[PDB]
Amino acid sequence: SSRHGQKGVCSRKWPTIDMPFSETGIQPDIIINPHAFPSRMTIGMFVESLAGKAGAL
Amino acid sequence: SIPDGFKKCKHLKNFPLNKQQQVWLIKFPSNVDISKLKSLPVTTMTIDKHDYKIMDDTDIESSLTQDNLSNMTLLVPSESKESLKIASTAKDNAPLQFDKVFSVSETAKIPAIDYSKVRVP
Amino acid sequence: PGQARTADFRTLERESRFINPPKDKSAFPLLQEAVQPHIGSFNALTEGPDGGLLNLGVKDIGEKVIFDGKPLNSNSGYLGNKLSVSVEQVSIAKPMSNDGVSSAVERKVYPSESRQRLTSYRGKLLLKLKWSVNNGEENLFEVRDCGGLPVMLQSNRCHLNKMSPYELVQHKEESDEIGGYFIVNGIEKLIRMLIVQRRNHPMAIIRPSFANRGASYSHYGIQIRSVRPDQTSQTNVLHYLNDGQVTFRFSWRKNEYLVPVVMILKALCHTSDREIFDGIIGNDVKDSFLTDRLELLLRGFKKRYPHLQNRTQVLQYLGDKFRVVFQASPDQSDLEVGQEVLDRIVLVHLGKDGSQDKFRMLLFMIRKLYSLVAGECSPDNPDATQHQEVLLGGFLYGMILKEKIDEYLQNIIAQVRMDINRGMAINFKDKRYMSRVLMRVNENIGSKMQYFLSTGNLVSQSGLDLQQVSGYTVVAEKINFYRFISHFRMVHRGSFFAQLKTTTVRKLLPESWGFLCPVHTPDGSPCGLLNHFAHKCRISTQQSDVSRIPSILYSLGVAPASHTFAAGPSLCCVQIDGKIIGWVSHEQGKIIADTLRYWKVEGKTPGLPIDLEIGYVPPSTRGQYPGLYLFGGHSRMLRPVRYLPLDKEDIVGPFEQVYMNIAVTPQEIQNNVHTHVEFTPTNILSILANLTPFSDFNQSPRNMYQCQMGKQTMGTPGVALCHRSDNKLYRLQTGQTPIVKANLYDDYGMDNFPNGFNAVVAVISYTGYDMDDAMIINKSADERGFGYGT
Amino acid sequence: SVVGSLIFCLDCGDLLENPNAVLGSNVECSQCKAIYPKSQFSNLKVVTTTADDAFPSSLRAKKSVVKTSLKKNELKDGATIKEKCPQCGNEEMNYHTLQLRSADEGATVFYTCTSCGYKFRTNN
Amino acid sequence: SEIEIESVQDQPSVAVGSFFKGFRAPSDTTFDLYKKKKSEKDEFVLHGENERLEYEGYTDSSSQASNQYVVGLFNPEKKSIQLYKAPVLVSKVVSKSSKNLRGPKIKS
Amino acid sequence: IVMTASAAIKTPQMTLPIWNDVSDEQADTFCKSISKVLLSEVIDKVIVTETTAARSYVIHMRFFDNNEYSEEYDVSKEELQNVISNQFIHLLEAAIVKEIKKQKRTPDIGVAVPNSKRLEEDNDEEQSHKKTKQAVSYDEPDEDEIETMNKVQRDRQSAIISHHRFITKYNFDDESGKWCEFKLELAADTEKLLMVNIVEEICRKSIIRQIPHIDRCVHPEPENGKRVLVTEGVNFQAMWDQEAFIDVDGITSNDVAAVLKTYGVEAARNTIVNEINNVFSRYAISVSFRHLDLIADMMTRQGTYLAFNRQGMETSTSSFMKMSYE
Amino acid sequence: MIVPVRCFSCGKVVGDKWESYLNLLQEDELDEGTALSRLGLKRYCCRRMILTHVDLIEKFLRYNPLEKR
Amino acid sequence: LRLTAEGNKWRTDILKTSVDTGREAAAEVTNLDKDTPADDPELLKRLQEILRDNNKSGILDAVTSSKVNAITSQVVSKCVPDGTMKKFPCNSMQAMALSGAKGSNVNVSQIMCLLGQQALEGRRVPVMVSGKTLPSFKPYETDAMAGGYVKGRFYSGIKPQEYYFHCMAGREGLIDTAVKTSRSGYLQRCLTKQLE
Amino acid sequence: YQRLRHMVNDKFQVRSTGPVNSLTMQPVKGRKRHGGIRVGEMERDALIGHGTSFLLQ
Amino acid sequence: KAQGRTSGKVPIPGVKQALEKKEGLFRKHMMGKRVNYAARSVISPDPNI
Ligand SMILES: [Zn+2]
Ligand SMILES: [Zn+2]
Ligand SMILES: [Zn+2]
Fold this sequence. Notes:
This is part of a larger assembly, with three copies of chain A, one copy of chain B, one copy of chain D, one copy of chain E, three copies of chain F and one copy of chain G. By secondary structure, chain A is of the alpha+beta class. Helices cover 25% and strands 16% of the residues of chain A. Chain A has one helix and two strands. Chain A has one helix at 43-56; strands at residues 9-14, 30-32. Chain A starts with 8 loop residues before the first strand and ends with a helix. Chain B has one domain (1-121). Chain B starts with 6 loop residues before the first strand and ends with a helix. In chain D, 4% of the residues lie in helices and 28% in strands. Chain D is mainly beta. The chains are: A alpha+beta, B mainly beta, D mainly beta, E mainly beta, F alpha+beta, G mainly alpha. Chains B and E meet through β1, β2, β5 and β6 of B and β1, β2, β3, β4 and β6 of E. β5 of chain B pairs antiparallel with β2 (15-18) of chain E. The complex binds zinc ion (ZN) (3 copies). Chain G: Keywords: DNA-directed RNA polymerase, Isopeptide bond, Metal-binding, Nucleus, Ribosome biogenesis, Transcription, Ubl conjugation, Zinc. Chain G: It is found in: Nucleus, Nucleolus. Chain G: Zn(2+) binds at residues 7, 10, 45-46. Chain G: This is DNA-directed RNA polymerases I, II, and III subunit RPABC5. Chain G: Its main location: nucleus.
């Protein structure tokens, strides 16, 4: 779980050659499903996503 | 059964009783030398350049709307100046009630808020 | 620059601190502050200017008496030689151990040893027993070993007390070990904070339960929770019965007793009917509703008790009826026992020398009761933080401890009675007999306290004025650190109010703002019942010196109660800690409240401490019963807010706050409205709630849920793990500092217990295996160490 | 002495007995032995009335200056939103939101059809 | 507005007693006042006696530390007032009749 | 409905369809006429004057204006007088006697007045348990289910004085209906009563008007274009007399057992179906009448109203099935 | 606890970079993002590993059961 | 989750019409002139009367709620979808709501426009005996915000006052499942055992 | 991201045959000792509802 | 129907209590049973079956 009450159960350990990969050539550590958001409205996670990437950069 | 250190008040000084005259009770701070004053208002007053407030606490000592609801009874020197009698005026021995009770007490001026320093964008 | 606080990783500062634990003081004072209600209250048992709560309590117990029955041989109603037993002085040693015989001199024991041996961390409890033959004629003293008393970590009876971080590490403790818990059989237990009724204030109660004491009973009552210097309390209740009667109800030895209120009045002082009348009615004599009940009350006491005309006679009456209930000795007159009932039970906060103060107060209650019945004032809500206070673990420990000493003194007497009935040869003046008697008495008080800490079971002969018998202690679960810290900031009302099928005790209320966190409560069944304080909320552990407040009050125009007979909501009754000082108008009452506040915060008036609660309650139309209630006691919820006339910190409680205009931000301050503003809104949240990033952008249940998840994560239970023998530990191997952080995360030293990691997260539908809140972890990420734990 | 229906002794402070319960023709203070002629304490009246809120009723409520009832119109529970009513086909419905069961699941939305009155909930 | 102070008495002259509302005492009744000089504060004790009642009174130790009391005689056909210092005593009336009534040490 | 088959349900109701010639104003009035009305509802204020041959109370009742309470409750000044004359005074004297009694029957002072661990689990901790559990049966019943399973006047005054214990005068505002006043004289020795309050209590019990079993009748909005009134309470026969306003042939009820008693088993069967369906319709749950008919046919299999409890089960021909039930 | 060997996402060795990164912040007085760049950590994947590492081990190491404190 | 600049203007313009709404509603429930000042002695006396009585407070709450709710519907009706930066089908948040995949128009609007009135069991937000709903509001405030009308939206965040009130609303359903839960199990057993 | 500890005794189980209880000769309760899985009253009713008498048998 | 033994111990179940313990023999071991040839597991989603 992220720090926004978005708790999830590991369904697969997905092979990295099988993951999606970015223009930056990175594969995601974790996938969370967009359908996990519109009912919970944890908009603070979306903010954390930008802030964290900008911080790492 | 006199307690330790008290002596009977021997020679009691005089108390001239009687639009007629009125009898008041007044509270002053214990630190105030009453023996040297002049003024007195009928709000605010200053005594020795320090400022106080006079309050009409009559409705606490008694009732404003109804008679005989007085907490206090006045005791004046009797016909010997060696004891006290209940002060009366009614030619009925109906005890005197205080016409007014005043409290001279301390006052403080609380600073106004400085909204310039305090209400900041 | 010279700005507002932006975020920092503090990489060098942190890593150096890891390597070089400070040799002077901990770097995270906020963390020590959070555990203060526990350490403080425990310390109160032995500190204070008066020997501490234990010594106060043992003084309150007094003597236990027995006679030997011997003759003298004369005419006589002699009962034999008298034995008076009491405890004179209590003491608690730090945990030592004389490894074996010769009492091979003592050596200190540190808690790590207790953890590793899986036993208890305990100090020797010593009682100075006074054994008095014939009222002083010959009295024996002996100090008794009453067992190993579990000691609170980091308290004034723990060996870690006053240790720098460096020294803690050298003694195998966590670098910033908070303490506040006990170690019992290797298990870390804490006494959790309870919410109880605010001290020494007569609440107006409307409660259905009151109607079921009889068909005559109405649902109107007055309830006051008086507490003694030793912190034990005694609750008094007034009931209004429909036929006009007003009964006084108290509790003793787990039974309830009823006495007509007029009888308790006429037993406190010499008094006349008119005096009682003036005390309740005051000037409001055209109030038909009032004068009628008062005639009922007075005429009813006469005609039920026509032979009681004296104050002495009334005391004798009570003494006769209660001498069995109160276990009086055969030498105690009816007159004495009467006084004893008053001292032990009636408005106990005002003390033995305050019979005149109990009188005025009891009158005040009766009027407020009549005020409630008439609808003149509204009832006080006991479920609102406004009328609550917090029973602390150390205080509770003290209360139970006082009871065990009381049982202890009774056991001695019990043993001597057995000797007497068996015909055994008894000489109270012989020390060999005193020691033979004590040999047969269970002196292991320490282990009884251990039982309490171990099981959470309250075992006592009075209910300690609490509504339940269990759930008092709990394991300080160390699942991770976030859960650990939470334990010490948790407060509930008790299992009693949990089975009750209303919502009101569970609702989040305005009167909690700044005191309880609006986020950090569990879902499921304890929802709303288990709460956590806001992180900046403090709890008083001492009584502030209010000895000089009466003179300040008098100088501000308060009419002294000793010569002022007033009553009812037409004017402002002025009280300090449940003692009536006098009377003023409402207008002046407000000015006094405001003046007192200004002077308090200015800090230049001696005898007037910042933390004084100024409970001014204005007149209103059918609102709360008015008056000026000042408090300076133990167990108070207090929080910092910013006072605008000066620009200083003020301290504020939940009782006063209800009428206070406190702006949330400096921008929102209105003229002629706000007197204070918050330091920052973050003051109203708990620790965990404060750590959730961008919480003001999540729907509330998510922020609520995060507090639950954070306490359930595999993180860092601690770092001194190799000296521990815990039942179960979970450990994340590699944590990271969060890039997105609350600044308070640094202030609570949270990097010392990494609780998670910075993942690269994609919000994508792609695998097909991630619907219904299922998630995906990268297989190579996993294989490279991501999230590994033990 | 007299405070309507209660008479206190002048000497000590005690409440004198109610004359009409004393066998003699005088009343004596059982406290200080003061004597009071029965003819002095006659036919004193007390007037009690029922409290304003004693008899709640449709009529008593109209005696109030503020609104004590709602008409049929103002009864619109909640805001309105575009959401086809499954029953009648209507475009608007009124709605409310709650969290049910646990703090883990998504919000529950309660709908009430604006025209046809059909009510339903949704967890999706 | 303004009031002139003719005289101010510093010596024991009159006293003030709070008994209760509507309080009076029989015609004859007479009260003996007593005074002790404790620090720079004046303590007072009152004792009165009539045929079947006693009267006692004390000065409140706590209030007299910060309150001073003064009785005033006012002349409204003048702007004048006459002040006399007076103690305020907390007082009770005791019935000689029932004062010493008492039950047995114990009804055993 | 299904578990207790109660004769005494918590909120019994009849629904009365009204004719078309009955306008909306006439309906509203009609509601007022069959609704229960307490004496307190028409009283504005009571003033009591007490004095001290004996101890006397003058009780003066000030009602709201005649036009106002007629309009509001459909109550006539005659009806109002009638209740005070008969059942009110009786009750008041009754209450008084009982209180005088109490003044003679003596507190006695020194005599005394004679799993939470799992309740502390959050929803995660609780589900950790439930997730592993292999249930023996359905859920055990909750605490609820366990608990369950001036000469016309001069003479009228004397008539009243001779039928009561303490009244010495009695008068009613026969002209304008704004007041009632009477005087109670109690024995001289009697110690003081809170008479105004005793009177308050009796007022809230005195019944001006009431149809047996009916409380309030109400006029709700025409649901589905069915113009209808709704009563708190059930009394079919009383409604049978209002043939002038309501179509008696279309009266329906909440109360399965009432319908059974008055209209028979087939009627009761239908009422069960509709009532169970009403339960689910309110939560927008759809359940086939095919199931409902079966459940209701079962419940009425003996011509009666049988619940699915011990009693209904007790009839079953199978002893092994009973043995495995309770 | 101790520096991870590889970046969780990149696969890129990162464990040789902790001691130097500290020396960069300390000695050369650089900011964090400049120092990360100088060690060759380009992808935010990899910058994250060193930027947010907590050398918790240095705490664990202070409790050594095999030496007389 | 973004509105266009055009849309954000629409939103704040309609929101500015809620400014007086609470006071208009107070004047209506207290039966005073529509233009009565918010600090008018009589208005405050009548509000205090309202505060003491559960039924009356109920009315004040229902009427005020109805008005502010109309404002809420205006904002949403105007901004979603016409004021959104991304439109369906590219806007995944909208697409999930419309297609029935996940969420609802309600949820989208609380993210993009405003939370709305916080409602507790039909009433609004509790009021202390002093007549204040929070330490920061004066006694008998008529601002809709002081009664838990939240103009903030999850996208741009909510004020501390709104946050606190919104905690109340969130906790409500959870408290209700804890206390007002009826079980249906015993009923099912008894039906099946007889109908088996 | 936070990794949540297991709170539950998750571990699966399978039984073909195994230890039975002395009185009923029915599969013991166990997992750690090859206990059987319970078909309780609710599952009985479901099996009757299907009309599947052999599955019930 | 037996006189409580040696005030303490708690009674030993008789035949009635054996048949009626908890839900009772009938419900716990006849209307429902533990069975052979079955398994239990946590479930996980799969779109590919
Ligand atoms: Zn007398
Ligand atoms: Zn529709
Ligand atoms: Zn990387």
